[PDB]
Amino acid sequence: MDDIYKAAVEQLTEEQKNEFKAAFDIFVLGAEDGSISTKELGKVMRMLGQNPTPEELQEMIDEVDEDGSGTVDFDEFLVMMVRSMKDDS
Ligand SMILES: NCCCCCCNS(=O)(=O)c1cccc2c(Cl)cccc12
Ligand SMILES: [Ca+2]
Numbered sequence: 001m002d003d004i005y006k007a008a009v010e011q012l013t014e015e016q017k018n019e020f021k022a023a024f025d026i027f028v029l030g031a032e033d034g035s036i037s038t039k040e041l042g043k044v045m046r047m048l049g050q051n052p053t054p055e056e057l058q059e060m061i062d063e064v065d066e067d068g069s070g071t072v073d074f075d076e077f078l079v080m081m082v083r084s085m086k087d088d089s
Contacts, residue, residue, distance in 0.1 A: 027043070042054060045057075
């Protein structure tokens, strides 16, 4: 079902969309399809001011990976935001 999630997707316009889509490119500016991993992860967090081990970051991808695949597609991705948004933690 996962409806309670699509409910928020309707709130998202299109201006804030181009903001995220632009991020993916970074996480995968040379990957085949666009599957993100602890590999291209620490790559973006580098521009900020962090650079932990791929073992710790996996924890962030293991929480959303509701299919155990070690990836973050534009799918389960939205969920992440919707969650932290409607409820930060
Ligand atoms: N660590 C996840 C929290 C996301 C932060 C919200 C802002 N989105 S973001 O561009 O900063 C961003 C950060 C970390 C992982 C991402 C993946 Cl796997 C896909 C797309 C964007 C990602
Ligand atoms: Ca996944």
